[PDB]
């Protein structure tokens, strides 16, 4: 009792041929032959099937790259292009099918109306018949659709047999020698003179032009997607869709080519239809080929007023036939089958669009009833939308809008095969190899050129609705991840441009501040993220380091989940930063690994920004040694450093995004820069880049000095000063404050040999000897003295930037250098940044 | 010197006044009022000014968001929608102004010519007099404009005064009681019955339509951006622009309403113009309303043959007014002010474009004289375009094309505001009270509707020129970085898996075979990095080190290998390869495969080096990496002009690729050869897959494997089966294995694990006897599988065997190296030993 | 489990017989 699955004949080919075949076979193809001649009609047919052949190749390539499921064509396009461009146009495909149901039931109601009028009495006026008949027949179609998916197939094969009987009837009729009723109306069976005369065009009327015939034929060679829209009922779609679609195209094209060339070799363009017009001996000389076959249509031809023949009578194909009502049965089948195919297609596509929740308020229609989970709620919606348009009943102006909703799907079926094939992601590997990448682009271009040629003001409606529904999904971010070629183009393009940096040398004219930020977990201290993402956005690189302190190195896959949870926090704050974490047994070695290996070619960090050890007085003195060693390692690797201190600390750990002070307008405060060393120009470059943004543009920056030097860079610097007095004894309380803060790090050895001091300094290298204290007294006094000047001139600034001191390695221990760093920036309101470049010409240009 | 600035009255409001004032105020509002009445002319005016006031709200919300130079009107489009649309729209907006200069100048030349022909004689042809006067006038306007922006701002206040004296002239003329001549043309003073008559439409002529009057008025109400194009010369652009711009619109629309409603109460719609219509009693009755004042106007009213009146005479204001030449003066001012305002706005935008760094299309025009900071080379471009279009003198067929350029600008400005406000862009945050994004979206929709309502074929040329420019400009560091940060939002799917590699290549010119092999399947597909570890104690980053790194990059680029280069410093090789695995890369472009060479001389090297060589693979497996080990007969190292040539640089031909797929590793062992065969040198190579299985299920398993490889779409040719995989090898091959595991054998009897560790702590690479006995079958399997491989794959182009992995702590590093040596010896072709990380890299599905 | 697995169809389907993780064939037991 498993649900029934279909083969390729009964499931794809029959459905596609029934959909393609319409009424233009029976009521307009002979007239097109009469107008344009045989040769130009064949050219119209071939130009028309080129587009739908290229689209068949594209949709055959798409559906042989995986396992196709119960979604139809929306499934293919959306899983090969993405939710934006797939869900924008899976909603107009499903609507255009629902209204094509109505526009194929109207064409059957008109035929029944004509049949009833010319036999007896009609029901009502000749427009409300179109309503009664159409509404009653769309209901039997709905009952067939709801009755199961194995009764739809029986109806389709019945319609197919009816159409083939029609073809046989016509082709038998064109061979019987003509009768009097038929030869008077123009039909003289196959002749060479009536075929040669009828090759050349003979245009007559307002719409008798080449483009006026193309515009009639082309929308009837379309509809090739019907059998691909039941992907969820086929045994193996990856082998059933490419065969069915392409053989349906081939065989319907052969049918179109045979009908025209056969009708145009038997029927003459002008004929009168009066049995008295048989030729009379001695009636001078007459007009036309029909004079040889013994008929006389001179008067008609001349006065231009005869009502029969290939170019005047629309049912020429019904009188050539051996029996007339069989052609009417063929016309019934050719319309009912297309209506049923559209009704099934719309409700299969809409259910899949409603299960993938991209749009609001339409979930209700995705429920599946019964064992095959048929869309019972989608059939009723397509039924309501079809009845609403049947009641309008004059759809001569709504047809161009709908026929352009279907050429906009043709342009995205062809863009899906062009994009997937030029992106070339490992993983796109289709079984169907008989397609091209440039033909699939020509198809996408020409389906829009044709869209505009057919009707300029309906192409606009199509494209406008496509844009509206595209932008809704773009602004909604529906969080679905199906492998898509747009997702695979981002990597292609990132790699393509990143490699291209290798072709450019290292120069002095392209310095950029590329910084490595030691944040730990980014949300534990977002102030660093904000400060650094202010001045480096859209200009250079920014990496957020993180060291996972611990004895086991093993990248179990759990780690990737945490890393992706930290990489989305930075994507939500709209920070343009990378995230990188490493494993090491202590923080110094993790930082050293990040400094050695991170980056990619020429895009690698050259500045190290790190917070400040707020708790260095309480923590075990083994941590201070490694903290200072980090800065020493940065200076050894030829980096530049920045130490950032805030009064309240940076670690906020001790949902919603937290807010810091670097996200807000500063005002008309000042940025104070204490330029004490010609480090190269980083100390002056960080505030110049920072203050040029909107939030800091209303501040004036006042560089101090320990005039023509600052001029040549064109840094736009406001004030220049001279520090009052840097080397004098400060107040005794400040000196004792420095002296007692460092005392718990003192060795108390009087004065001894340096080796002897090292003998007990080996176990604790952070101990300070009295000789080291004595021989670095002036510098310590300078550090304690400059704090008072900073307190004076910068009580109420918005940012203070001071030159960073360097302790002589070996002769300056860790605790004393850390005390210096503590004593240049204690008790200050603003953020304080201590910078020192790496002796490189930085200001050699603007940035 | 001191740069000149302007307030809001003289800098924004006056400019927008004079830009909006046109000839329509003088020559066509009386006609429109007669043709459509008062109450419906008011509707036209209000509907027209709604669009311009919504765009004014948008353009004044942009000005309270930062500060912009002159002509940065497009800078928001290029910030919100990319600097391609922005640049193209800026170029079109400047060109349209440059042509508007020509249109206003010829409109002034027509008036002066028609005045001159009356009071004198025309020296030359009517058409050429236009081409002389227009060129002279544009030259004089350029001379005024190019000589400072203080003189232009004085001329454009003289124009304001001339217009305001004409308003007073007209309004004092309407109050004087009519003269005998003036009443003979239609003028009677303000009176109620004429006002009541004229409240309702009276359509006459081929243009008497509501839309026929809208299409004439609406393009005469735009010009509100004349004050926002000089935001760089304003004193306070965030308070001056929103107020001046929005008050100018109000004060011009009040004037339009006042003039229409005050001339509608004043004249009659038609009048004879002859003085001999004195009315006397006796001749019938009077047919009209003018007879109540003593004038017979029946001669025209029945025959439609009078040349005066409100609906027939275009120059009614010249006679209603108390003095005629002042209205001519008003027209002169109203035209020259518009021409000047269009000439300065074109220069500002062209200069901003030529100075733009993100749009070089037209950045090479000329050298500009910035001594007085004038846009000289933005003035000489507008002057040339204006003079060309004046000489052409074809206008009325180019007016709609250029009226739609401005509406394209309006639509994209409003949509850029909406887009930046809906996507919460970080940097769009205006401070303007009355700004709503839904109004800024209605403005865009309406600006696009009106384009196609006014002239449909000129809105398809305006759009088709934006797309020509946009697609012509689309087709190093700033692109490498903006695309790498864009990868952070895409998620990872199994369909887009890329094999990124870390090649342990040393100096890339000691083993070119490794780089040649790995740069074959990763070319244009995925990341490749050439690692190098410099063994030495802690070493200073040095200038020479970067010189060496540049030399190796140059060598790589000369060979046209598309790879990155990276080197680290470490105490030994293993501890540096860990650094490279942990930190190399950038974001989502980080390696996940490790490629090494074969330790060719492990037999004779110091057995502590094989410990580290195997530890490298152990660490790779610890980090979730895939491993490839490559072997050649003659070794990889070639150190033992022209670059060296390997066998991977030549066409392989018809030989085969043999994949001994023995264990399921997720499919990397199948996906490396597939990508290798996607390239031109390996595309003619047959691929054979050998799998192991039983002897009673040869077919049952062969069909299953063929079915599996067909759902992956890989396209491999044969599938063989190996049933003799568990036999014993030949005796003299087992002996060859066991004599090689001898120097590494512990010979400890059979002791507990503690006793083994006792003598294995110093050397951990030796093999206990228990580990010899428990690894007997696993080892003879390698010995026999080598026999099978050498049996089948004697003359292939590439052999691929799945790599065994030994349990950490149950396989000493000499046993595992012995297995690796056994699997691949005595073979001619290159041998690759792949082993993925047990995660799927291949998929059946598409979702 | 503990021993490596020969190629098989069930490892790639979506719906038992899960291939061992790299930590199960490599980490010390
Ligand atoms: N696990 C880590 N990973 C990366 N960087 C770190 C880590 N721990 C500390 N850092 C860096 O070192 C700086 C100072 O070290 P310290 O441990 O004193 O900071 P903290 O005390 O954690 O936070 P705060 O400085 O706000 O009190 C930190 O601000 C941070 O920049
Ligand atoms: N300095 C290095 N940096 C990175 N990888 C290396 C380095 N030295 C060796 N390797 C990798 O290890 C493999 C084996 O190294 P080995 O010491 O055996 O050198 P070899 O010349 O390749 O072989 P052999 O020394 O046995 O002739 C090499 O092929 C290479 O891939
Ligand atoms: C005959 N049809 C023509 C357009 S004729 C104009 C019209 F009346 F339709 F507006 N195009 C398609 C295309 C497809 Cl692809 C499908 S279908 N069911 O495969 O998806 C159905 C049709 S059609 O039935 O509408
Ligand atoms: C009256 N003008 C109409 C165009 S109607 C005449 C036509 F061009 F169609 F031939 N629109 C605009 C728009 C702007 Cl924005 C500006 S301006 N200086 O602010 O940039 C100037 C003008 S206008 O003065 O040319
Ligand atoms: Na049909
Ligand atoms: Na003007």
From Swiss-Prot, chain A:
Name of protein: Solute carrier family 12 member 3
Residues on Extracellular side: 114-125, 174-208, 264-323, 393-397
A GO BP annotation: monoatomic ion transport
Record GO terms (molecular function): ATP binding; sodium:chloride symporter activity; sodium:potassium:chloride symporter activity
Disulfide bond sites: 286-291, 300-306
Role played: Electroneutral sodium and chloride ion cotransporter, which acts as a key mediator of sodium and chloride reabsorption in kidney distal convoluted tubules. Also acts as a receptor for the pro-inflammatory cytokine IL18, thereby contributing to IL18-induced cytokine production, including IFNG, IL6, IL18 and CCL2. May act either independently of IL18R1, or in a complex with IL18R1.
Predominant cellular place of this UniProt entry's protein: membrane
Result for mutant: residue 359 to H: In GTLMNS; 48% residual Na(+) uptake activity; no effect on localization at the plasma membrane
Matches recorded under Pfam families: AA_permease, AA_permease_N, SLC12
Topology class, membrane: Multi-pass membrane protein
Stated consequence of mutating residue 407 to F: In GTLMNS; uncertain significance
Regions that span the bilayer: 8-37, 38-59, 91-113, 126-150, 151-173, 209-230, 242-263, 324-347, 378-392, 398-414, 438-457, 458-469
Species whose genome carries this gene: Homo sapiens (Human)
Consequence of changing residue 256 to A: Strongly reduced sodium and chloride ion cotransporter activity
Residue positions the entry lists as glycosylated: 276, 296
Assembly and interaction partners: Homodimer; adopts a domain-swap conformation at the scissor helices connecting the transmembrane domain and C-terminal domain. Interacts with KLHL3. Interacts with IL18R1; this interaction is increased by IL18 treatment.
Result for mutant: residue 19 to A: Reduced sensitivity to thiazide diuretics. Reduced sodium and chloride ion cotransporter activity
UniProt cross-references to InterPro entries, sorted A to Z: AA-permease/SLC12A_dom, AA_permease_N, SLC12_C, SLC12A3, SLC12A_fam
Swiss-Prot record, chain B:
Transmembrane segments: 8-37, 38-59, 91-113, 126-150, 151-173, 209-230, 242-263, 324-347, 378-392, 398-414, 438-457, 458-469
Keyword Secreted: no
InterPro entries: AA-permease/SLC12A_dom, AA_permease_N, SLC12_C, SLC12A3, SLC12A_fam
Disulphide bond pairs: 286-291, 300-306
Effect of residue 407 to F: In GTLMNS; uncertain significance
Recorded consequence of changing residue 256 to A: Strongly reduced sodium and chloride ion cotransporter activity
Effect seen on changing residue 262 to I: In GTLMNS; complete loss Na(+) uptake activity; partial loss of localization at the plasma membrane
Domain of life, source organism: Eukaryota
Stretches for region Scissor helix: 476-486
Residues the entry annotates as binding Na(+): 18, 21, 334, 337-338
Residues that carry a glycan: 276, 296
Annotated phenotype, changing residue 62 to T: In GTLMNS; associated with deletion of N-436
One GO cellular component term noted in the UniProt record for this chain: membrane
Documented effect of changing residue 410 to A: Abolished sodium and chloride ion cotransporter activity
Domain notes: Interaction between the cytoplasmic N-terminal and C-terminal domains (NTD and CTD, respectively) is essential for SLC12A3/NCC transporter activity. Phosphorylation by OXSR1/OSR1 and STK39/SPAK may activate SLC12A3/NCC by facilitating this interaction.
Protein name as it appears in the record: Solute carrier family 12 member 3
Organism: Homo sapiens
Record gene name: SLC12A3
UniProtKB/Swiss-Prot annotation, chain C:
Function: Cation-chloride cotransporter which mediates the electroneutral transport of chloride, potassium and/or sodium ions across the membrane. Plays a vital role in the regulation of ionic balance and cell volume. Important for maintenance of endolymph volume in the otic vesicle, probably by regulating ion homeostasis. Also plays a role in normal development of the swim bladder.
Region of the whole protein represented: 138 to 172 of 1136
Compartments in which it is found: Basolateral cell membrane
Protein name: Solute carrier family 12 member 2
Organism: Danio rerio
Positions of modified residues (Phosphothreonine): 2, 15
Assembly notes: Homodimer; adopts a domain-swap conformation at the scissor helices connecting the transmembrane domain and C-terminal domain.
Lineage top rank: taxon: Eukaryota
Annotated family: Belongs to the SLC12A transporter family.
């Amino acid at each position: 009792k498993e649900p029934v699955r279909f083969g390729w004949v009964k499931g794809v080919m029959i459905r596609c041929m029934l959909n393609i075949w319409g009424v233009i076979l029976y009521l307009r193809l002979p007239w097109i032959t009469a107008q344009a001649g045989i040769v130009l009609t064949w050219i119209i047919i071939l130009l028309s099937v080129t587009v739908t052949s290229i689209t068949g190749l594209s949709i055959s390539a798409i559906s042989t790259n995986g396992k196709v499921k119960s979604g139809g064509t929306y499934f293919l396009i959306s899983r090969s292009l993405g939710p934006e461009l797939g869900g924008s146009i899976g909603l107009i495909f499903a609507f255009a099918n629902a209204v094509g149901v109505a526009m194929h039931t109207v064409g059957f109601a008109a035929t029944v109306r004509d049949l009833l009028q010319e036999y007896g009495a009609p029901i009502v006026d000749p427009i409300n018949d179109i309503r009664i008949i159409g509404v009653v027949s769309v209901t039997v179609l709905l009952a067939i659709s709801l009755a199961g998916m194995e009764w739809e197939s029986k109806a389709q094969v019945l319609f197919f047999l009816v159409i083939m009987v029609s073809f046989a009837n016509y082709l038998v009729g064109t061979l019987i020698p003509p009768s009097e009723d038929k030869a008077s109306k123009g039909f003289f069976s196959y002749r060479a003179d009536i075929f040669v005369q009828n090759l050349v065009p003979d245009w007559r009327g307002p719409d008798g032009t080449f483009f006026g015939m193309f515009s009639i034929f082309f929308p009837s060679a379309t509809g090739i997607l019907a059998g691909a829209n039941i992907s969820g009922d086929l045994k193996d779609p990856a082998i059933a869709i490419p065969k069915g679609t392409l053989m349906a195209i081939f065989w319907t094209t052969i049918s179109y080519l045979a009908i025209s060339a056969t009708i145009g070799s038997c029927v003459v363009r002008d004929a009168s239809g009066v049995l008295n017009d048989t030729v009379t001996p001695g009636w001078g000389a007459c007009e036309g080929l029909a004079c040889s076959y013994g008929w006389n249509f001179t008067e008609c031809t001349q006065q231009h007023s005869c009502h029969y023949g290939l170019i005047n009578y629309y049912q020429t194909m019904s009188m050539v036939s051996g029996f007339a009502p069989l052609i009417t049965a063929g016309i019934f089948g050719a319309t009912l089958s297309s209506a049923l195919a559209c009704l099934v297609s719309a409700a299969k596509v809409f259910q899949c669009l409603c299960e993938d929740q991209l749009y609001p308020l339409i979930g209700f229609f995705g429920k599946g009833y019964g064992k095959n989970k048929e869309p019972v709620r989608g059939y009723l919606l397509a039924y309501a939308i079809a009845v609403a348009f049947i009641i309008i009943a004059e759809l001569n102006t709504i047809a161009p809008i709908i026929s352009n909703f279907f050429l906009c799907s043709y342009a995205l079926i062809n863009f899906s095969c062009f994009h997937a094939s030029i992106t070339n992601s490992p993983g796109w590997r289709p079984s169907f190899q008989y397609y091209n990448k440039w033909a699939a682009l020509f198809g996408a271009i020409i389906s829009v050129v044709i869209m505009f040629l057919l009707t300029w003001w309906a192409a606009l409606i199509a494209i406008g609705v496509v844009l509206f529904l595209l932008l809704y999904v773009i602004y909604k971010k529906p969080e679905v991840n199906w492998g898509s070629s747009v997702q695979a183009g981002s990597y292609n393009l990132a790699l393509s441009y990143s490699v291209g940096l290798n072709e450019v040398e290292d120069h002095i004219k392209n310095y950029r501040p590329q910084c490595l930020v030691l944040t730990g977990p980014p949300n534990f201290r977002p102030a660093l993220v904000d400060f650094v993402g202010t001045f480096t956005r859209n200009l250079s690189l920014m990496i957020c380091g993180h060291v996972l302190i611990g004895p086991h190195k093993q990248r179990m896959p759990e780690l990737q989940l945490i890393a992706n949870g930290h990489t989305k926090w930075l994507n939500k704050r709209k920070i343009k930063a990378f995230y990188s974490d490493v494993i090491a047994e202590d923080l110094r070695r993790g930082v050293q690994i990040l400094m050695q290996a991170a980056g990619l070619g020429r895009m690698k960090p050259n500045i190290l920004v790190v917070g400040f050890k707020k708790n260095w007085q309480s923590a075990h003195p083994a941590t201070v040694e490694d903290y200072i060693g980090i800065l020493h390692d940065a200076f050894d690797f030829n980096y530049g450093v920045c130490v950032m201190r805030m009064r309240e600390g940076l670690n906020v750990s001790k949902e919603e995004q937290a807010t810091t002070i670097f996200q807000s307008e500063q005002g008309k405060k000042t940025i104070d820069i204490y330029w004490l060393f010609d480090d190269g120009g980083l100390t002056l470059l960080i505030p110049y880049l920072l203050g040029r943004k909107r939030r800091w543009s209303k501040c004036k920056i006042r560089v101090f000095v320990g005039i023509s030097l600052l001029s040549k860079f064109r840094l736009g610097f406001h004030e220049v000063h001279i520090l009052p007095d840097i080397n004098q004894n400060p107040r005794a309380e400040h000196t004792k404050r420095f002296e007692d803060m460092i005392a718990p790090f003192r060795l108390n050895d009087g004065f001894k040999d340096e080796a002897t001091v090292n003998e007990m300094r080996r176990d604790c290298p952070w101990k300070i000897s009295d000789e080291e204290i004595t021989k670095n007294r002036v510098k310590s006094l300078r550090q304690v003295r400059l704090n008072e000047i900073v307190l004076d001139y910068s009580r109420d600034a918005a940012l203070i930037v001071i030159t960073l001191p360097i302790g002589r390695k070996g002769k300056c221990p860790s605790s004393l250098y850390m005390a210096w760093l503590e004593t240049l920036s204690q008790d200050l309101r603003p953020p304080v940044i201590l910078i020192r470049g790496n002796q490189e010409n930085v200001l050699t240009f603007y940035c």
